[PDB]
Design a protein around this ligand. Structure first.
Ligand SMILES: CCN1C(=O)[C@H](O)[C@@H](C(=O)c2ccc(Cl)c(OCc3ccccc3)c2Cl)[C@H]1C
Ligand SMILES: CCN1C(=O)[C@H](O)[C@@H](C(=O)c2ccc(Cl)c(OCc3ccccc3)c2Cl)[C@H]1C
Ligand SMILES: [Co+2]
Ligand SMILES: [Co+2]
Lengths: 381, 381
């Protein structure tokens, strides 16, 4: 069921913002490893004395990397005279975030039709305000509320090119990398308490429950009206023989935060060929591939969706496959993106649910816990 | 003249340590951009709960990238029970360094025959102690004194594989990149006051004056007995029409610090071909190339050292050339390595002074200030 109970008009995921120590090095690493182009900047060269922010894009996916300059560069500024392009930015908040959590997502940004209305309705329905609505150049409105931990849900609305004050980058510096990634499919948070987290977020958004799972975790997914904005949330389950991976996240992250970003590819085979070629030359590493027994068991589960040859390519690339009663899911997971065993990336491609493809087609891969475990045992033999 | 007045036995540059927010992303960016292999690690996977440290190597050049984990992981440790592999490391010092200066060099490490003796002699001759001599696994001794700003001169001595507690990395993760870089040639500091800086460092090392320069700066170079450890130091000169680039460094860096690392290549043409291919795909950018008038004037200055074809290759790659009465210097400069206009890298190759090649053969390029300026004017025409 979909009660379509959004309390304001939500469109799509807009961007993800990482708070960094050095935005330059993280942005360059991510650009090469994921095949994202440098598309906009806001920094000393654009008159911003407060923060360095670099925008990578691949299709509709937007990754923003931001780091603070020395506060001394802007010591004479006040908010009415700021040279910051993102008015919610604060040197102390950013340094405190990074000291506490390390490299990670500060903002999950969704485009809405009116960010001031979304903020007002959200706060009236229980959201904790983080940054009030600010109109940039009479063109864009931006506002932020707390989502979980020190992650904010950012609302962006456009009257009508990322944000005012950002400049398109020199095409000499803008190499047209593209490994096939096209949009953000979902963004997953880890929290200590799922119930209160869900009640809070669904309370102020009107997002509805899309999925739920009850090893080592409990999970539920909140969705917008057209189920294009998808926000899974996990909690640890204590008492299993193996320690909860969610608890390990919370320990190393110093609390709740964003666990993974799932990036939709229009050609997951090409995306993984390109990413795996670069893993050891500055790119991203991938989690260990499942045993050959996993791929032999794949024929019986999805042999009507994927040819043997396509299953063989999944095996070459370490790709996992899951399927519900409506669609089929191809997915794979990177190792953590930075020093701490916290945030990682998922590459996903979905098959089915054509009408456009409906959001969340095929689920989130929960069947792969069981099937991975079974394959583990079968391969040990 | 070389009075050979070193107060203890110094061998060669050993390594450079960067203090980072996220060591993983900086190390991966640098590996790809400079062609350095991942060769050792000390992190959670090696039992280090305190800091993440990754070692890149190219020939004899060693770059170490270190970042702190959450202090909570090691909250029960004391120094006698530490899991840190670098005993001088301190969470608060590292976070304070990075907040103040951004990404940059914390340690210039030189190998000596006895780090305890070097430390004791240095402090007895005026050095400010930073970390006392500590013996690691009865095999390596490490000690640190202040050099300038928050940069330390680190002494390392070996009884006889980087440091105990570091592990060689999986060869799957160790891609054998190599663009030709072979060793650290010199490491340059920017300070507010050159006189006191020189008196301090020469006072505790016995290093002698190798070179001196008196636009926008004054500079002098301190050298070890065999002039293989070379430490130029710059101060700003105020009052010129254009603002001192050294002063700009000091403002953005919040004080004195390391300005550039000059990396010797055994084939500067190959190094620059490889680095320039990667500038816009995660590597390093280079400063603007000199006008064609610079390279036409090169024939008259070094036409006995470099053929026309080799001069044409210098022009293709933006390489600068200088020459003294003893040798010839090929050099080029990157744009800043991170967000702030502070630290950058120089690639260098020296021709001449064969006997082995004597250190500092050809100087440091001071003739290129004048010749660049002249070329500037000639090209405007
Ligand atoms: C339970 C509800 N879920 C969501 O809603 C999610 O989007 C989702 C998901 O993507 C997913 C699906 C299958 C597996 Cl096997 C998996 O773990 C991989 C892994 C193990 C160890 C270290 C790194 C990564 C994940 Cl993380 C899942 C968590
Ligand atoms: C004066 C004594 N010197 C040393 O001892 C040094 O090693 C040395 C050196 O390497 C050098 C040589 C020629 C030039 Cl043109 C130059 O500036 C390039 C540049 C300009 C603007 C932004 C980035 C880089 C440098 Cl930095 C020099 C400073
Ligand atoms: Co997922
Ligand atoms: Co130099």
């Amino acid at each position: 069921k979909n009660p379509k109970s959004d309390k304001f008009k939500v469109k799509r995921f807009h961007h993800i913002e990482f708070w960094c120590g050095d935005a330059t090095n993280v942005a360059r690493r991510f650009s090469w490893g994921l095949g994202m182009r440098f598309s906009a900047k806001s920094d000393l060269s654009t008159g911003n004395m407060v923060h360095a922010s670099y925008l990578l894009t691949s299709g509709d996916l937007r990754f923003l990397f931001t780091a603070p300059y020395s506060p001394s560069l802007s010591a004479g500024e006040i908010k009415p005279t700021t040279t910051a392009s993102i008015p919610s930015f604060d040197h102390g908040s950013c340094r405190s975030f990074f000291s506490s959590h390390g490299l990670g997502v500060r903002a999950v940004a969704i485009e809405v039709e009116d960010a001031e209305s979304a903020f007002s309705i959200s706060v009236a329905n229980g959201a904790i305000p983080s940054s009030p609505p600010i109109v940039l150049n009479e063109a864009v409105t931006i506002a932020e509320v707390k989502l979980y931990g020190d992650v904010v849900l950012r609302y962006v609305s456009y009257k009508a090119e990322f944000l005012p004050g950002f400049e398109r980058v020199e095409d000499a510096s803008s190499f047209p990398l593209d490994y096939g990634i096209r949009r953000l499919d979902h963004a997953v948070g880890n929290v200590p308490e799922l119930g209160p987290a869900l009640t809070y977020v669904a309370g102020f958004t009107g997002f509805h429950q899309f999925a739920e799972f009850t090893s080592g975790l409990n999970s539920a997914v909140l969705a917008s009206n057209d189920e294009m904005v998808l926000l899974p949330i996990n909690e640890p389950v204590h008492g299993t023989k193996r320690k909860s991976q969610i608890q390990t996240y919370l320990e190393h992250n110093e609390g709740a935060g964003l666990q993974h970003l799932a990036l939709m590819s229009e050609d997951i085979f090409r995306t993984l060929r390109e990413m795996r070629k670069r893993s050891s030359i500055g790119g991203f590493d991938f989690m260990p591939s499942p045993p050959p027994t996993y791929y032999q068991n794949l024929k019986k589960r999805v042999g009507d969706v994927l040819s043997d040859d396509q299953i063989k390519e999944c095996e070459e690339l370490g790709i996992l496959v899951d399927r519900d009663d409506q669609g089929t899911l191809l997915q794979i997971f990177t190792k953590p993106l930075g020093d701490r065993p916290t945030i990682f990336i998922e590459i996903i491609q979905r098959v089915g649910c054509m009408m456009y493809q409906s959001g969340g087609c095929g689920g989130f891969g929960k069947g792969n816990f069981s099937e991975l475990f079974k394959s583990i045992e079968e391969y040990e033999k």
